[PDB]
Amino acid sequence: SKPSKRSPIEDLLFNKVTLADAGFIKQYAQKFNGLT
Amino acid sequence: LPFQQFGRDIVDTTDAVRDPQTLEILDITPCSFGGVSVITPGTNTSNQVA
Ligand SMILES: *[C@@H]1O[C@H](CO)[C@@H](O[C@@H]2O[C@H](CO)[C@@H](O)[C@H](O)[C@H]2NC(C)=O)[C@H](O)[C@H]1NC(C)=O
Numbered sequence: 001s002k003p004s005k006r007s008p009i010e011d012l013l014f015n016k017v018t019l020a021d022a023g024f025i026k027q028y029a030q031k032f033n034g035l036t
Numbered sequence: 037l038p039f040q041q042f043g044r045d046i047v048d049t050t051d052a053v054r055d056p057q058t059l060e061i062l063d064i065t066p067c068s069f070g071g072v073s074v075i076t077p078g079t080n081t082s083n084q085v086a
């Protein structure tokens with residue numbers, strides 16, 4: 001019933017661990033300065 | 037603020053300026069860049085690449 005077809009535990013694991021790069025959301029600061 | 041001329045990110049890089057004549061605040065987005073990868077079958081089969 002959920003997108004990605006992950007288990008409730010996997011969904012929790014992805015919800016507890018987060019990415020916090022010093023940048024902005026990009027669809028593909030945003031690319032820092034020569035760093036990808 | 038009335039006295040700030042430009043701004044910076046958490047890594048001390050410039051990301052905004054105050055226009056000296058209109059006082060509009062402008063964000064600075066870096067111009068697009070990235071790596072270039074060349075995909076090849078190898079020159080012993082074909083010279084077509086992506
Ligand atoms: C000096 O700065 C003022 C703004 O502080 C400029 O005046 C603006 O000029 C634009 C057209 O370029 C108008 O649309 C705005 O309404 C003007 N605003 C004000 C408050 O006058 C002005 O052109 C600048 N240059 C000179 C020589 O005064």
Ligand SMILES: *[C@@H]1O[C@H](CO)[C@@H](O)[C@H](O)[C@H]1NC(C)=O
Binds near residue numbers: 027
């Ligand atoms: C690419 O740009 C178009 C512009 O309309 C946008 O709709 C699309 O979602 C963009 N895709 C990515 C991956 O940035």
